[PDB]
């Protein structure tokens, strides 16, 4: 049991999957000069806990803008139009000893998702609802929204071989916590934080939750994101 603290946010934790074997880092020019906030920003932003029942198909969050209303990070998104960060993501499950199940906690950089009924697009509020997650579906759906059927998560790939990305299994038999570090994967050193979704944290239950008639009918999944090494553009003159 390790009680991590960052700034004015302390969580209680119980091995880290460093995404692509690199730890996030700063970009290191007088023509373009970055600003490193360091203060705040790096604290833990615990999202709303998500109840995982027997019939839950999955969830996804789209970062960096899932934190668009989360304190100083969410506020520096509005004053700087360029930025980058690292996002340590803790995912606890705090189930009991008699619950069973298994989760895939994967980050999937550049998850371009497909519309439900092709030949058209979706109204941009279907990919993300800031803090709250968009759930997947168990079967096919229609309408101007994301094709959120599992087995074809979002991108038209098989959902089983979604393990190529930075992932972590949460098998309630053995463990309960996951932690992933995603060192800002992008083709340009800095990019706008409202246009571009750098990665898509999606939690997908492979083995479904199961229990008997006495336990709690759900297992709350807690998501915590710590934006590390966030740096922005300069606002001062040169």
């Amino acid at each position: 049991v390790r009680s991590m603290t960052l700034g004015n946010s302390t969580i209680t934790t119980q091995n880290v999957v460093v995404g692509y074997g690199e730890w996030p880092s700063y970009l290191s020019t007088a023509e373009d000069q970055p600003t490193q906030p360091d203060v705040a920003t790096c604290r833990f932003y615990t999202l709303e806990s998500v109840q995982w029942e027997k019939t839950s198909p999955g969830w996804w969050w789209k970062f960096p803008e899932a934190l668009k209303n989360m304190g100083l990070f969410g506020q520096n998104m509005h004053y700087h139009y360029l930025g980058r960060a690292g996002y340590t993501i803790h995912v606890q499950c705090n189930a009991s000893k008699f619950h069973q199940g298994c989760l895939l906690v994967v980050c999937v950089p550049e998850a371009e998702m497909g519309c439900a009924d092709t030949d058209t697009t979706f109204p941009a509020t279907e990919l993300t609802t800031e803090d709250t997650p968009h759930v997947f579906t168990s079967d096919s759906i229609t309408g101007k929204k994301v094709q959120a059927a599992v087995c074809n998560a979002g991108m038209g790939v098989g959902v089983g071989n979604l393990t190529i990305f930075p992932h972590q299994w949460i098998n309630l038999r053995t463990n309960n916590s996951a932690t992933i570090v995603i060192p800002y994967i992008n083709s340009v050193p800095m990019d706008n934080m409202f246009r571009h979704y750098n990665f898509t944290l999606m939690i997908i239950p492979f083995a479904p939750l199961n229990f008997t008639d006495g336990a709690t009918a759900y297992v709350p999944i807690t998501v915590t994101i710590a934006p590390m090494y966030a740096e922005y553009n300069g606002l001062r003159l040169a």
Binding site: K97, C102, T212
Partner: protein, 102 residues
Amino acid sequence: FCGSAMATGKLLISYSPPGASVPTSRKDAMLGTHIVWDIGLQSSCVLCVPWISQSSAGYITCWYQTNIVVPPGAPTSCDVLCFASACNDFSVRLLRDTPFMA
């Protein structure tokens, strides 16, 4: 094994060589190559199947050595996920077009 932390049982994972026939019974699978995988102790058993090539293959069957023993609180039916990759190093020669795309 994606079952409860209280469920306990044994599974017998047999491997047939690429020429051999499948075991029709649990005893005939026990007399060949197998691994009696105790679930209550470890929850993840790893194999490494050799002689895999093309240019009539093996079998990975699984048997109930014992049933799943479970206390009154935990559920009775469990699930087992499987995985697959290259064991140590993989050799591959002649590039072609994939059949899946039309």
